[PDB]
Amino acid sequence: ADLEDNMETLNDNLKVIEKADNAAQVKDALTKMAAAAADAWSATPPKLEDKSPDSPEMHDFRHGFWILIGQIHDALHLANEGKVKDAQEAAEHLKKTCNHCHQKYR
Amino acid sequence: ADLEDNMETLNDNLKVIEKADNAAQVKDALTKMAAAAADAWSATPPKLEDKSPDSPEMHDFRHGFWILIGQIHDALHLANEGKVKDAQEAAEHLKKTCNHCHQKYR
Amino acid sequence: ADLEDNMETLNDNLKVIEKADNAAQVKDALTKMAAAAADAWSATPPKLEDKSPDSPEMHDFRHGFWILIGQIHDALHLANEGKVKDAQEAAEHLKKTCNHCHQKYR
Amino acid sequence: ADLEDNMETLNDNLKVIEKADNAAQVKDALTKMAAAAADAWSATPPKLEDKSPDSPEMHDFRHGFWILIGQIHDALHLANEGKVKDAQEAAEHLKKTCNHCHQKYR
Ligand code: HEC
Ligand code: HEC
Ligand code: HEC
Ligand code: HEC
Ligand SMILES: [Cl-]
Ligand SMILES: [Cl-]
Ligand SMILES: [Cl-]
Ligand SMILES: [Cl-]
Ligand SMILES: [Cl-]
Ligand SMILES: [Cl-]
Ligand SMILES: [Cl-]
Ligand SMILES: [Cl-]
Ligand SMILES: [Zn+2]
Ligand SMILES: [Zn+2]
Ligand SMILES: [Zn+2]
Ligand SMILES: [Zn+2]
Ligand SMILES: [Zn+2]
Ligand SMILES: [Zn+2]
Ligand SMILES: [Zn+2]
Ligand SMILES: [Zn+2]
Ligand SMILES: [Zn+2]
Ligand SMILES: [Zn+2]
Ligand SMILES: [Zn+2]
Ligand SMILES: [Zn+2]
Ligand SMILES: [Zn+2]
Ligand SMILES: [Zn+2]
C-alpha cells in the first residue's frame, strides 16, 4: 500500500482499539497497525519529495516510524499477557507519535 | 532516595527541560531523570504497601518505570545527536507516562 | 522484495559494517538493513507456509524482526552520536538475532 | 548494594536461567536481574573513578545498563506470555551485553 493507505489502516485500527470489546480484537488491530508502520517506513511524504533521501528531515521521518513500531511492540506484549485494558490505554501513547510526525511532515 | 524525592527530581528536571535554552541543560536534566526513575524502580508506593513484591500490581507498577527509562534513553540520543528541540519535545511523551502511573497507583 | 532478497541485503550490509573505514559507510549500511528488516516483516517463511497469518509461529517470527529493528535503531543513534566504533560493534549484537531466527524458522 | 554485589546478582540469576526448569523461576530471576541493573546504573566502576561523572566513558557505561534493562524487559514479556523457552534463550542476548561492558570497564 502507499503512505495514505497505511495512514487509513493506522487511523481505522486506532479507533477499533478505543471502542474495542474482546482481546483478539485489540491483538489483531495492533498487528495490522505494526504491518502498516513497517510498510510506511520506506515511503517519501509529499512535503519532502524535494529533499535528499538521507536529508535530516527524511532521517527524522523514518525515526517517527521506529518510535511507533516500538510502542505497538510493547502494547502487543501487554495484550498477549491478558492486560487488554492497559493495551487499549497504549492508544494515548500512540496518538502522541501520530501528532508529532503530522506536525512536521503531513 | 524515597519515592516522593525521586518524583520531585522527575517533576523539577521535566520543568528544566521545557524551559531550557541550551543543549547542556537538556542532557543534564535527562540524565538526572534517568537516575531518579532507576532509583524509583525498587520502591513500593502507598496504595500497594499490602501487596507482595511479586504481585501483578507491583509487576505492572515497575513496568511503568521501564517505559519512562525507555523514553529518556531515546530523548538523550536525540539530544546527543544535535536534535535538541526534538529532545525537548520528548517531554510531551514523558508526561503521558507520568499521568498513566499516577491515574493507577497514586 | 522477497524474503531471500531482504536476507542478502541484511548479509551484504552486515559485511559492509564489519569492514567499513568511515562513518558514512556504517550509517548507510544500517539504514539499508532497517529497510530490509521492515520489508521482511510481512513475509511468510517456507517452514510456516501451511500456518495461518495470526498463528503463534507467525507471531513469534515477526517478533524476531522487531528485535532486529530495535538493535539497528540503537546502533544508528550510536553512529549519529560520533560513536562509530560502538555502532560497528553492534554488528556482534545483530548476528545473535540473525542466528536465533535461523535456528527456529530457516 | 554496591556494583560488585549487583554483578554477583546478575551472574547468579543468569545461571538460574540457563539451568531453569519451571516458569516463575525464570520470571523471578529476570526480575532480580532488572533490580540489580537499575541499582547498578548510578555506580562508578573502579577503572573510571578518575573520570568526570559526565565523561564520554561514564555516559557509555550507563548506556550499557540501558541496553541490559531493555533486554530483561523483553525477556520478562516473553516469560509472562508462556514462551519460557524463548526467555531462557534471551540469556545469549544478555551475555553479549555483559561482555561488551566488561571489555571496556571491568
Ligand atoms: C510520520 C513518522 C508519521 C506517523 C508516525 C504517523 N503519520 Fe499519519 N501521516 C503522515 C504523513 C506524512 C501524512 C500525509 C501523507 C500524504 O500523502 O499527504 C499522514 C497522513 C495521515 C492521515 C491522512 C490520510 C489521508 O486521507 O490523506 C491520517 C488520517 C493519518 N495520517 C493517521 C495517522 C495515525 C492514526 C497515526 C498513528 C497511529 C499516524 N498517522 C502516524 C506521517 C505520519
Ligand atoms: C509509576 C510508574 C510512576 C511514574 C512513571 C511516575 N510517577 Fe510520579 N508518582 C508516582 C506515585 C505512586 C506517586 C505517589 C508517591 C507517594 O508516596 O505519595 C507519585 C508522585 C508524584 C508527585 C508528587 C506527589 C503527589 O502528588 O502525591 C510528583 C510531582 C510526580 N509524581 C511527578 C512525576 C513526574 C513528573 C513523572 C514523569 C516524568 C512521574 N511522576 C512518573 C508514580 C509514578
Ligand atoms: C527471522 C526473524 C529472521 C531474522 C531476524 C533474520 N533472518 Fe535471515 N533468514 C530467515 C529465514 C526464514 C531465511 C530462509 C528464507 C528462505 O525463503 O529460504 C533466512 C535466510 C537468510 C540467508 C540466506 C538463505 C539461506 O541460508 O537459506 C541469509 C544469508 C540470511 N538469512 C542472513 C541474515 C542476516 C545477516 C540476518 C541479521 C542481520 C538475518 N538473516 C536475520 C529469517 C530471519
Ligand atoms: C557495564 C555496563 C556492565 C554490564 C552491562 C555488566 N557488567 Fe559485570 N561488571 C562491570 C564492571 C565495571 C565490573 C567490575 C566492578 C569492580 O568493582 O571491579 C563488573 C564485574 C562483574 C563481575 C565480577 C564481580 C566480582 O566478584 O569482582 C561479574 C561476575 C559480572 N560483572 C557479571 C556480569 C553479568 C553476568 C552481566 C550481565 C548479565 C554483567 N556483569 C553486565 C560492568 C558491567
Ligand atoms: Cl521495536
Ligand atoms: Cl507480543
Ligand atoms: Cl513481577
Ligand atoms: Cl545519539
Ligand atoms: Cl499475531
Ligand atoms: Cl544519536
Ligand atoms: Cl526499557
Ligand atoms: Cl513483563
Ligand atoms: Zn513492556
Ligand atoms: Zn508475543
Ligand atoms: Zn515524539
Ligand atoms: Zn523541587
Ligand atoms: Zn530513537
Ligand atoms: Zn549516548
Ligand atoms: Zn501508559
Ligand atoms: Zn549480495
Ligand atoms: Zn541507546
Ligand atoms: Zn537520528
Ligand atoms: Zn533471540
Ligand atoms: Zn518483544
Ligand atoms: Zn508484564
Ligand atoms: Zn554491545
Alpha-carbon gap, residue D68 to D90, rounded angstroms: 11
Q: Longest Cα pair distance anywhere in chain D, in angstroms? A: 46
Which distant-in-sequence residues (6+ apart) come within 8 Å of D8 by Cβ?
none
Q: Which chain D residue has the Cα nearest residue B43? A: D35
**C-alpha C53: how far from its chain's center?**
21
Name the H helices within chain B: 3-19, 23-40, 56-80, 84-105
Q: Longest Cα pair distance anywhere in chain C, in angstroms? A: 46
**C-alpha D75: how far from its chain's center?**
12
Ligand nearest to the CA of A103: 1
List C-alpha distances in Å: A80 to C62, D78, D106.
14, 10, 38
Residue D60 sits at the chain B interface (C-beta within 8 Å): no
Which residues of D are less than 8 Å from B9 in CB distance?
Answer: none
Element at D6 (helix H, strand E): helix D3-18
Is residue D2 exposed (0-12), middle (13-18) or buried (19+ Cβ within 10 Å)?
A: exposed
Resolution (A): 2.3
Experimental method: X-ray
Tally of CA atoms within 13 A in the half-sphere of A40 that contains its CB: 25
C-beta of C45 in contact with ligand 3 (< 6 A): yes
Does the beta-carbon distance from A39 to C42 stay under 8 Å? yes
Contact status, residue C67 vs residue A69, Cβ threshold 8 Å? no
C43 sits in the region (left: phi over 0; alpha: psi -120 to 50; else beta) called beta
Q: D10: closest CA among D80, D81, D106, D83?
A: D106
What the block records as the C-alpha cell of B3 is: 519515592
Alpha-carbon gap, residue D54 to D57, rounded angstroms: 8
Which distant-in-sequence residues (6+ apart) come within 8 Å of D75 by Cβ?
D30, D87, D90, D93, D94
What the block records as the C-alpha cell of D82 is: 508462556
Residue D8 sits at the chain A interface (C-beta within 8 Å): no
Alpha-carbon gap, residue A44 to D24, rounded angstroms: 46
Please name the chains neighbouring B, where neighbouring means 3+ C-beta pairs under 8 angstroms: A, C, D
Q: D41: closest CA among D91, D72, D3, D96?
A: D3
Alpha-carbon gap, residue D94 to D72, rounded angstroms: 8
List the residue whose alpha carbon is closest to atom 22 of ligand 3. C7
Three-class SS of chain C: CCHHHHHHHHHHHHHHHHHCCCHHHHHHHHHHHHHHHHHHCCCCCHHHCCCCCCCHHHHHHHHHHHHHHHHHHHHHHHHHCCCHHHHHHHHHHHHHHHHHHHHHHC
Residue B62 sits at the chain A interface (C-beta within 8 Å): no
Q: Which residue has the cell 559485511?
A: C15
